Amino acid sequence: MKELIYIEEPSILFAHGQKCTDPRDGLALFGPLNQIYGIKSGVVGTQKGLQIFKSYLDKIQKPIYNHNNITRPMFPGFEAVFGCKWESQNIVFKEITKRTYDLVTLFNDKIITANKNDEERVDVWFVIVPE
Amino acid sequence: RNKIFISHATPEDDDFTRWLSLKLIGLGYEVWCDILFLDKGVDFWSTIEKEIRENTCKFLIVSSTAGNKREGVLKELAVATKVKKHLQDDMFIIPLAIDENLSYDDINIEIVRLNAIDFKKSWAKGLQDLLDAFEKQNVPDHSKSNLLYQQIFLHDKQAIEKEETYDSNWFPIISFPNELRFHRYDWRLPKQFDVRTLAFPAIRYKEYLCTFAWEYDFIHQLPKTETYNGQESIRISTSDILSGRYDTDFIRNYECQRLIVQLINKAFELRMKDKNVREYQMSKTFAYWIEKGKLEKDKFEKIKLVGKQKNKYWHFGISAAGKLYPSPVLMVSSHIIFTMDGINLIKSKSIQHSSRRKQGKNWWNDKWREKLLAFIRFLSDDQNAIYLNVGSEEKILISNKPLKFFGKMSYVTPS
Amino acid sequence: AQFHDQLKARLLEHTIPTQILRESTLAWRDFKNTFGAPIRDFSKIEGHLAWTISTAAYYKAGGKPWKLGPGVCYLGLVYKKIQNACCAAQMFLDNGDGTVFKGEVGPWYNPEKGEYHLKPKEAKALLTQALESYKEQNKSYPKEVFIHARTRFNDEEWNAFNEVTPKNTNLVGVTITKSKPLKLYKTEGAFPIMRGNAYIVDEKKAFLWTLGFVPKLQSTLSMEVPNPIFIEINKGEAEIQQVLKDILALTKLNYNACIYADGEPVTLRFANKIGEILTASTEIKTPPLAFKYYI
DNA sequence: TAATAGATTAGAGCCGTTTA
RNA sequence: AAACGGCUCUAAUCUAUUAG
Ligand SMILES: [Mg+2]
């Protein structure tokens, strides 16, 4: 018949100095702390992968639904929550048309050439792995 | 008259008011804010008057330090007081104290009478309180904003301070054999014989024989141990080992503690060998389950242990091992063991894994707890405890009821 | 099997925030099992899905999604097999109140096959690097250095730590052990034990339900029943309740996922991820030491 | 060197998506 | 490899002892 103690759930800070327990709820209500102006997306992969990424990004912009919305919070949309623009029309694309090493090398060398030679700046590179 | 007005200090407090207005429109309420809805190239004060005394359910005034003494906020507040007197509606003015620096007693004289909706900390909870106040006064698409409402309400449902009781997987060891006896069978035990094959638990330690049994239990398969002098055997009061008192050069306290632990799990194995339950060898231990058709309606008491799903059969099984660190207690681990026809095991383990995850997809705490308690109570020869055989006269006794726990914090069960 | 690990390893020399998405993730409906429903049934979690992705998308793009709510540096070090490699992660609060969570890298190598502990030299270098990072970020040495790991710390490496640790600085050793068979049920309700409850086994050892049921989401952070994580204060002096609070706080900063909290302190999880990144390929001098390049 | 345990530790993979 | 979980499988190490 042992005592079980309670630890109060810590609150993670958000924008405007507000505190919420769930990162999802705090993000949806007040938003992230710092305001980056957008995501300079870079997509390296197959044309099919690029199209899939663009479609999923456009789906990300608009609000999307969970099956059970109370056990897991909604996603209002990237602009609504984080306040930065990540539209799919501003995607920097790199086409690809020991086996592990060379498959790794293909994407790495494409990203290296795009980061070194290409003028367009990419904040983060979304490696679309073929399946 | 169906509109909500929010006055504030313009140069400083914009983020709070913008967020509050956006959430209010998300909730379906019509709002009017000077930094959002006041048009450009328009007489601003005339339009503020028109909105205040023509179309306004409620007049919300942020009570920040600067927003209190501000001339524009004061003017909007004065006109709001006049329209409050005109409309005769109670609680038409709603202050919103959002700054912790200014005291509730330093609020300007026109507002201090009203109860200020707290916004100093946790704007979400203050907004929920404001929403409750709006609903109580019936302040004036259905399935898309109730989600935002429920997220506002559910952001803060800290645990209720109620008493809860919990069953565990730790079954305490009620009683223990008084003496741990090492039998010096230098030759009576063959050096190439396996100590795990004896009908009673025993381990090969030094030149002795670590077991809880008497020196004459191992006779049927090891007859040469007969006529062995009892003075040769060394008996240790194991309560000293449990307390850690016995620490001599012959054997260290942790080593004999481990020896007793090993005795516990292999006596467990031997008992389930005699407890009418089949075995499965996992990575590190043995699980013991019940076959189909061996129990009434495949259930013990009011709890089932074996069932069917998608041309497959599942049995609830247990695998137990002892530890004596906080207390002498045997922990159990529960598993679902799968079969084709209900008696014959599946040789493949990938299909076993997939079936285990599929059946545990819908299993919850009540199901697991009741299955564990029923299976352990089934293996119980005694009404409130189970037996492990370590000797003819020495006994290992395991509590049927887990170590019970309780907590001062709990939750309302979802309906 | 090592595609992600090697790809992330080969981009550390030139810092490039990279995130790997498979087509079965972004478009799960398109790829089926050829006999029915799609291989990855993501409909129940679709919004959650996007959440996580956006969170990752917002993290590697230099955006801070959420901080934590001083003077204490949480150092979680994890050991990876290949000889073993120890890779760390540090989380602390500066004078600007912005939680700095970068993660100490440059793994320290123990030549022994099965010894998941650091030699005096490697432990000395690790804790010296942690102190130097804390000093350059805060302009002072930490009051408390919260060393924690998935293994207990041996006496010799603890003595090395204490030798190289500065004065008026008390550092503590904490062990997080997962998959301990303590299946604590609930007899009244149909839902498992609610998260946050702690079983204090000893003044130095306790079982913390860092994951379980949660009233805020009206559900459990996990399926099945929740396994509490063992918190052992094997080295150092600290209150068990404060250590449990610190573990709960560290279970919040999982920037790699958009979930309420995870069962282990995510400092260990991120250190483990960067450890896989390091062990993936050839050693890189002065690794990036930021999670947007590994996670 | 091999074995037999407990304790620890590490790796992998595999399925569900957390009962309303 | 969005992610966390439960689960499974395997291996290794440290102790204690025994046979090479
Ligand atoms: Mg990641």
Q: Number of C-alpha atoms within 13 angstroms, CB side, residue C94?
A: 15
Taking CA atoms, B212 is separated from A28, B180, B208, B322, C208, in Å, by 63, 5, 13, 15, 36
Task: Check if the beta carbon of residue B239 is closer than 8 Å to that of residue B300.
Answer: no
Looking up tokens 């639904």, which residue turns up?
A: A65
Residue B132: its H or E element: helix B123-136
Q: Which residues of C touch A40 (CB under 8 A)?
A: 61
Chain C residue whose CA is closest to A40? C61
Nearest by Cα to B211 from B394, B397, B388, B398:
B394
* Interatomic distance B98 CA / E3 C1' (Å): 37
Strand D: which of residues 67-86 in chain A lie with Cβ below 7 A?
A: 67-72
Buried b (16+ CB within 10 A) or exposed e, C143-172: ebbbbbbbbebbeebbebbeeebeeeeebb
φ/ψ bin of B227: left (φ > 0), alpha (ψ from -120 to 50), beta (otherwise): left
Residues with Cβ < 8 Å from B230, sequence gap 6 or more?
B215
Report strand pairing: B278-281 vs B329-339: unpaired
C-alpha separations of B109 from B24, B113, B130 in Å: 28, 8, 22
Q: Do residues B329 and B396 lie in contact, with contact meaning Cβ atoms separated by under 8 Å?
A: no
User: Would the Cβ of C115 be found within 7 angstroms of any atom in strand E?
Assistant: yes
Angle between helices C3-10 and A99-116 (to 10 degrees): 40
Helices (H) and strands (E) in chain A, counts: 4, 6
Residues A34/A82, Cβ–Cβ less than 8 Å:
no
Positions of chain E reached by protein Cβ under 7 A: 1-19
Reference B168, options C231, C197, C239; nearest CA is C197
Backbone angles phi, psi at B411, to 5 degrees: -140, 165
Report d(CA A24, CA B94) in Å as an integer. Answer: 30
Resolution in A: 2.9
Q: Which residues face C147 on adjacent strands?
A: C75, C173
B57/A40 Cα distance (integer angstroms): 45
H/E stretch holding B398 reads: strand B395-399
Distance linking the first and last C-alpha atoms of chain C: 16
Tokens representing C294 are 């590994």
CA end-to-end span of chain A = 53
Taken as a whole, chain B contains a residue count of: 415
Task: Report in angstroms the alpha-carbon separations of A7 from B158, C209, C223.
Answer: 12, 10, 22
Look up residue B293 and give its two tokens.
């058709």
State the CB neighbour count (10 A cutoff) for residue C51: 26
- Interatomic CA–C1' length for residue B355 and nucleotide E12, angstroms: 30
C155 phi-psi bin (left φ>0, alpha ψ -120 to 50, beta other): alpha
Environment class of B40 (CB within 10 Å of its CB; exposed 0-12, middle 13-18, buried 19+): exposed
Scanning every residue of chain A, which has its alpha carbon at the shortest distance from the alpha carbon of C243?
A: A7
Q: Does B144 contact chain C (CB < 8 Å)?
A: no
User: Distance between alpha carbon B126 and the CA centroid of its chain, in Å?
Assistant: 29
Q: Looking at CA atoms only, how far is residue C214 from chain B in angstroms?
A: 8
Method: cryo-EM
Helix (H, G, I), strand (E, B) or coil at B285: coil
The stretches of chain A forming alpha helices (DSSP H) are 23-29, 47-61, 78-81, 99-116
Question: What Cα–Cα distance (Å) separates residue C266 from each residue in B113, B368, C14, C250?
Answer: 49, 29, 26, 6
Contacts of A74 (CB under 8 A, 6+ apart): A28, A63, A65, A66, B147, B148, B151, C47
* CA atoms of A66 and C43, how far apart (whole Å): 7
- Beta-strand runs (E) in chain C: 18-22, 72-81, 84-92, 100-101, 108-110, 144-149, 170-177, 197-199, 205-208, 213-214, 219-220, 229-235
| Dist. CA A93–CA A96, nearest whole Å | 10
Q: Is C256 annotated as a binding residue?
A: yes
Burial (0-12, 13-18, 19+ Cβ within 10 Å), B73: buried
CA of A103 to the centre of ligand 1 (A): 20
